[PDB]
Amino acid sequence: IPEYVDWRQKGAVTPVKNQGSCGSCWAFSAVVTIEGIIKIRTGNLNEYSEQELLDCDRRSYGCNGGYPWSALQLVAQYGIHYRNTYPYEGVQRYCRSREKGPYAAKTDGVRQVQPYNEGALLYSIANQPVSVVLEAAGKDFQLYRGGIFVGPCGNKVDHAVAAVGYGPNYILIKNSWGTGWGENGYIRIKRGTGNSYGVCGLYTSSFYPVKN
Numbered sequence: 001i002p003e004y005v006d007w008r009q010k011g012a013v014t015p016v017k018n019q020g021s022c023g024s025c026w027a028f029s030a031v032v033t034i035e036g037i038i039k040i041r042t043g044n045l046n047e048y049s050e051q052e053l054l055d056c057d058r059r060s061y062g063c064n065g066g067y068p069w070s071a072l073q074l075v076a077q078y079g080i081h082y083r084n085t086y087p088y089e090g091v092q093r094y095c096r097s098r099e100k101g102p103y104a105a106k107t108d109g110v111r112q113v114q115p116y117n118e119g120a121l122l123y124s125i126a127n128q129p130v131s132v133v134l135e136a137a138g139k140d141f142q143l144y145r146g147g148i149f150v151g152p153c154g155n156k157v158d159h160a161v162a163a164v165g166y167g168p169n170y171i172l173i174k175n176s177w178g179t180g181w182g183e184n185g186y187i188r189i190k191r192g193t194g195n196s197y198g199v200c201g202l203y204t205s206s207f208y209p210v211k212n
């Protein structure tokens with residue numbers, strides 16, 4: 001695999017979003033990976049619906065948190081609507097998929113990256129954007145404004161984001177806190193520290209959609 005990957009440069013990443021006060025990061029994370037895999041497979045970059053996952057995933061807890069895996073499983077079983085058909089409201093409502101017409105895209109499955117393994121995560125990122133988790137509760141992460149981040153942070157993962165690339169000493173992450181956080185909404189997290197958890201627990205739990 002190559003030294004640099006950046007799915008933004010391949011036209012496979014949509015603009016940065018803001019989840020607001022709602023604990024919907026799990027849905028934002030899953031949607032980034034859907035937007036990426038559909039571009040890779042079909043050639044078209046579209047925005048898909050975080051709100052639909054928020055409303056419709058009965059394995060997750062709405063604005064009180066949830067699971068990237070179950071969001072991706074839902075898209076493989078049913079499908080997902082475009083974002084403008086089912087836009088983000090920042091509050092859980094009833095599932096409105098049926099009344100909003102046919103789904104816009106559908107995947108075939110979900111796979112996990114081998115956990116606690118930097119090379120396995122880089123290999124997966126080289127193929128497509130990946131949903132990853134990290135510990136975001138610390139003030140250092142909250143206040144990050146740029147540079148290659150090394151903490152301070154622990155491994156108590158609590159926030160789902162998307163890995164959209166990497167370089168020699170970092171992994172490139174799209175966050176859902178708006179463009180005013182980090183590097184236009186992104187963070188470069190240091191890699192190569194030898195800590196099997198990853199910086200801020202980044203290697204704890206990573207998933208990606210499968211589409212034939």
Ligand SMILES: *[C@@H](C(=O)OCC)[C@H](O)C(=O)N[C@@H](CC(C)C)C(=O)NCCC(C)C
Nearest residue numbers: 022023024025026065066133136158159160
């Ligand atoms: C993430 C978010 O919107 O902001 C985090 C600061 C959500 O709170 C969230 O879904 N967190 C999630 C942890 C990862 C994403 C799996 C979570 O705690 N979900 C609850 C399920 C289980 C831990 C009981």
